[PDB]
Symmetry: C3
Subunit: 211 residues, 3 copies
């Protein structure tokens, strides 16, 4: 006929699609990882070549981690020093910061602050980034203003343009299927959540050995 399969065979194939996925649902996980790998490739320039995205470490770094993070995210605050320590112990490693507004208004405001500072004065970014991360309270307008005053960045205006960069980060995180912070792109892998320094150190080395 016009079909290579018999109708009875077609019916069994359809049943086998269900049975295979229900009995071996790990296939779905593998498929999602494959979808993530393709997303990393398609969004590569947004990840690594966005001039508006702050960078910690050498511009000439041979490995670049991409940190999707939130200044109001508790394990982001605790993980960020570990990311920065990698750049200190491994000069060939840099970290790109992708602030996200996940935890609400103050997160967006904080992100707007660091992104505006980065554009106006890149060298001044790190101090504010760190001050916001080490803050032990949920951020608000007053505390963010204090952070900028305390890092000598209070002269720098928060721009509407920086909110577009922030929106790009948000769109990027969605395209990569990231729905939690901290999320860290390391080579072909997206690390979900914080990890201790030794594990991070191992993972970056495994990726350093691939260059």
């Amino acid at each position: 006929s016009n079909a290579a399969l018999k109708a009875a065979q077609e019916k069994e194939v359809r049943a086998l699609v269900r049975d295979t996925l229900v009995s071996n649902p790990e296939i779905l996980e593998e498929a999602i990882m494959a979808l993530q790998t393709k997303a990393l490739a398609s969004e590569h320039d947004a990840l690594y070549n966005d001039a508006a995205s702050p960078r910690i470490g050498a511009k000439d770094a041979k490995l670049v981690l991409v940190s999707f993070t939130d200044y109001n995210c508790p394990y982001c605050k605790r993980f960020d020093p570990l990311l920065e320590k990698i750049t200190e112990q491994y000069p060939d490693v840099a970290v790109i910061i992708k602030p996200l507004p996940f935890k609400g208004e103050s997160s967006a405001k904080a992100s707007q602050a660091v992104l505006s500072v980065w554009k106006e004065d890149p060298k001044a970014f790190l101090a504010l980034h760190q001050r916001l991360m080490q803050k032990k309270t949920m951020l608000d307008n007053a505390s963010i203003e204090d952070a900028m005053k305390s890092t000598n960045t209070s002269k720098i205006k928060l721009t509407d343009d920086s909110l577009k960069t922030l929106q790009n980060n948000l769109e990027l995180s969605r395209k990569l299927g990231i729905q939690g912070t901290p999320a860290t792109v390391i080579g072909d892998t997206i690390l979900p959540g914080a990890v201790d320094y030794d594990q991070l150190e191992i993972i970056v080395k495994e990726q350093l050995a691939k260059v």
Copy 2:
């Protein structure tokens, strides 16, 4: 035998389920969209015909957008004026508001406020909705109370019944697979995240041309 497929063929089919999804994981995306389309159809009356859900624009509107949103969500605040502007420029378009408690306690409180106002005095809803959206701070009990005082709605009690409407919105968002705000139902599409006015304007027109 009792099988249209040979055992060897069955084995290859199972392998092909995996290989097909891993090599072409876009199939999963298409399947999720199909699942979303079915969800929109099954939850149609909860979406469009819930009297307890506030509406912006004409009751006789031929196109109705459903805005899943959060008063503590930064890009919700910035996107909402665009949704309202559509109803001003396109009188045949209305917007149904589905407040969500995603960003925590104050979000629920704020939602409770607008939903309670809608039930007691529908015409009084819009002012409070707008005041809460334009608020530049993470909401709290005091700021929500100020919003109600500033919109002459402070006489209206927050009801436990409005918390049921809010719970319905939450359950609805889950059934639709919405895990982020703002999410906007436009015809057969669920728009993820905010978009600029011109893009929104194009999308609504494409849907207006289908009526």
Copy 3:
């Protein structure tokens, strides 16, 4: 040849993988549930046998619910009394509490508080757990300190070790595919979101009848 399927049959099978999942996307839901069931089994000891995780009810309980929850989550606050009431009406039912830091810094701080109290003085945990849940405001350092003072637990230090327990809860929630609170493990089911007492009462009975 080396293939049980003809090439034309292979092509049709690949097409049928797509068509089956797009026409019957409920298969994906069933597959995810299967993946959840396997996750519950593999993470069983983290769920039920973590000494660092607070328990409400009898240690010798024959049914144990696992409550993934957040002190800044509005419907968590309203659902928790229902979970505790089950343990009062059904002494053979206990509830394990898994605090999560989803809503930000104060959530982590609050979780750190209850987990630190549990380890130092288990009997003192419940009062603080309840006080934090009944709090009508988004928590902050001051309000958390007040909660501890008001429950005679302010002598107990927040430990860095409790932050590891909290991180375990977070990792556990991810492995189980939980991306919202309250999430309640009941036997082989993961209940998403809050439910009224009568429905909860029915579900626990259905699981009680399986022991």
